[PDB]
Design a protein around this nucleic acid. Structure first.
Ligand SMILES: Cc1cn([C@H]2C[C@H](O)[C@@H](COP(=O)(O)OP(=O)(O)OP(=O)(O)O)O2)c(=O)[nH]c1=O
Ligand SMILES: [Mg+2]
Lengths: 388, 388
DNA sequence: AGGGTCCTTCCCCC
DNA sequence: GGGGGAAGGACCC
């Protein structure tokens, strides 16, 4: 009964770099972080198997591949909220997912539009964009009409996004978040797709691995595998009772519903930010005692954000992880309710505030006792988080 | 600037029993939990029954000692919220602490009374109850007048509590929560005491051990004892730096401040419960076998409270504890999500879920998993934790 | 690489 | 019985 739209922008970071420097346009571009080509424009994703997640390693394919550093997220973040606000203008309930994805619940909006339609030209409702599996529309099917109207809102949102902000992107319209997200990616470049109910199974079985299902990460994908479960149908037909008594009645019942294209999670209002953090890294270069000056830097930038945006962090930490072969995690981080007075004027010219963050950041850091001394580490972050 | 009142009822449970069964008011009474005297009135406390164990012990030393069972908390919990609601009527910001204590921030109320007061009847203001250290009042001291007005509201709250609910209790009036709670117990049975600023140190140094300070339990008392800190003054004078480097910068600063009677924590509006837990402890009533039936009971009662409350529990918890020496450390717990659309049902067959909670608790209970010692360390404990 | 948002364990304290 | 601080997970994008 719900009409949800999932908006996913094209190579977001690359798009923000091109809009700020046309001389980069129509030129195989990739945005680089430390030693990572986080993403690149389409005129490169084909120009050398240059996809996301690769590094200078992928520069191999036509090294004429331009590069721009994308470590500072400031500009991406700002454009990201502009997209979200623009979307919130069409309808208030908008959920963010990373900096370039937005879920929008259009149910109420779609309905108001249909009501305003006389019982005469409601037979002229057409679709905007693609119909997922070239599925035939049935004008007398109330659910088809609502999703078509939904495709119309999507096209208006993408038009607005392009005309007002200069950004292109994809959109997917379906009856729930899972489906909307899966279908928004069927026609990748700058297009949109709507999913009619009769094609839900076709979309779900088009996936090659249960890992491709939104809501099934690296971990659970591993558990299921140990049970032989590899394909979407494997999960659809697996024994409920056993999966339940294997991952928990809560998770078991949820992930299995997803294998069928069922997902009742509501689109959540992703009102202002809940935490700010600035992490600066040195790729595994920490000696354990000579990192401290960096803390004075990365946390240095945060203040500028907090001061810019109101409200203050009544919390802090630093997050660290020791990585090796396989998986990542960490037992690094120290939090404390910062000083009342400091928290109330974190923009009145004081920088002595850093010393008190440094004492709790690292000298009051590590573990119980004094004994052995092994170092190793990989990049670390600090959170300015709970925010009230 | 702040005026806080701490309300603490006299032997709450015994008092609620004495009201239900009137013929007990003149006979020494103690309330019994499964074989431990949780509390007793001031007619039996005279013989000195400081919440001791084994009824028979004190029973034989008081032949006319008629005891009642206090395992079912339903009645106490109800009377407990009648108290809070009555207090919320005087002023909205009311914080609960257990079933018999309530903090109320009277700051705004006191001022309203002062401003509404004339410029002549300002020298007429008098105290209600005891002045802590028999300290002289200075009418021209704004802090004094405001605390005296606060003692006026405390007497009215105690009076209303007796006339409307039949309960007596003590009240403490001070400038923060720590001091309000310390001074409310100076004159113990059914009386109130206000603390003027000049006597704060006298009140704080009247304690015989740093663990008597509200906010310092067993754990901290021990970590302080190992540092050569036993008296309140030992803590006021201890080196900050060393303490910070020992307990953390946040606890260090907080714990030490309390040593001087400084406590800035705001009175928190408790509002309706957040949880609906029911813990059944038992002196070794069973091993591994038949908890299914225990779950059926603990969860059964919770289903009438949840229904009467009007809200639905989106998470269920369960914490286990095992037997250990000296302090009985028994912290142990697992928690998870709860089913939607079925579980929060209203239909006459709402109880069928019983089997779901059973499984759901069993997988959490087993994750503590027979391999540690975990089975039969103590009884059961459930929480319906988180209600919206 | 950056930069977030829920969960979850304790651990403490009346 | 009932609250909050911690800290890391596990997904994210
Ligand atoms: C996934 C992933 C994304 N990103 C950044 C890079 C992208 O610009 C931005 C958006 O995430 P994505 O949408 O997955 O990347 P994309 O928009 O560049 O690719 P597409 O055109 O197919 O939608 O967030 C990260 O920094 N790290 C990550 O691990
Ligand atoms: Mg994208």
């Amino acid at each position: 009964s719900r009409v949800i739209v999932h908006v996913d922008l094209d190579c977001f970071y690359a798009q923000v770099e091109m809009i700020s420097n046309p001389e980069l346009k129509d030129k195989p571009l990739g945005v680089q972080q430390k030693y990572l080509v986080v993403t690149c424009n389409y005129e490169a994703r084909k120009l050398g198997v240059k996809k996301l997640m690769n590094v200078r390693d992928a520069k191999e394919k036509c090294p004429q591949l331009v590069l721009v550093n994308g470590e500072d997220l400031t500009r991406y973040r700002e454009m990201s909220y502009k997209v979200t606000e623009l979307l919130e203008e069409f309808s208030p309930v908008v959920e963010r997912l990373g900096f370039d994805e937005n879920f929008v619940d259009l149910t109420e909006m779609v309905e108001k539009r249909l009501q305003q339609l006389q019982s005469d030209e409601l037979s002229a409702v057409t679709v905007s964009g693609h119909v997922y599996n070239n599925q035939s529309i049935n004008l007398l099917d109330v659910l088809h009409i609502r999703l078509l109207v939904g495709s119309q809102i999507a096209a208006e949102m993408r038009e607005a996004m392009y005309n007002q902000l200069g950004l292109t992107g994809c959109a997917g319209v379906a009856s729930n978040k899972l489906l909307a997200k899966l279908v928004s990616g069927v026609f990748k470049p700058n297009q949109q797709t709507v999913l009619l109910p009769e094609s839900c199974q076709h979309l779900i079985h088009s996936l090659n691995h249960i890992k491709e299902i939104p809501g099934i990460g690296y971990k659970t994908a591993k558990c299921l595998e140990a049970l032989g479960i590899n394909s979407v149908r494997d999960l659809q037909t697996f024994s409920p009772k056993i999966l339940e008594k294997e991952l928990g009645i809560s998770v078991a019942q949820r992930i299995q519903k997803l294998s069928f294209g069922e997902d009742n999670s509501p689109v959540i209002l992703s009102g202002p930010p809940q935490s700010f953090s600035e992490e600066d890294s040195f790729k595994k270069c920490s000696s354990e005692v000579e990192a401290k000056n960096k803390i004075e830097e990365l946390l240095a930038s945060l203040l500028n954000r907090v001061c810019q945006d109101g409200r203050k962090p009544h919390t802090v930490r630093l997050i660290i992880r020791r990585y090796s072969s396989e998986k990542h995690y960490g037992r690094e981080s120290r939090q404390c309710p910062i000083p009342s007075h400091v928290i109330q004027k974190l923009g009145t010219g004081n920088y002595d505030v850093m010393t008190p963050m440094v004492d709790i950041l690292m000298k009051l850091f590590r573990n119980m006792v004094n004994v052995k001394m092994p170092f190793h580490l990989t990049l670390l972050s600090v959170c300015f988080c709970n925010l009230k």
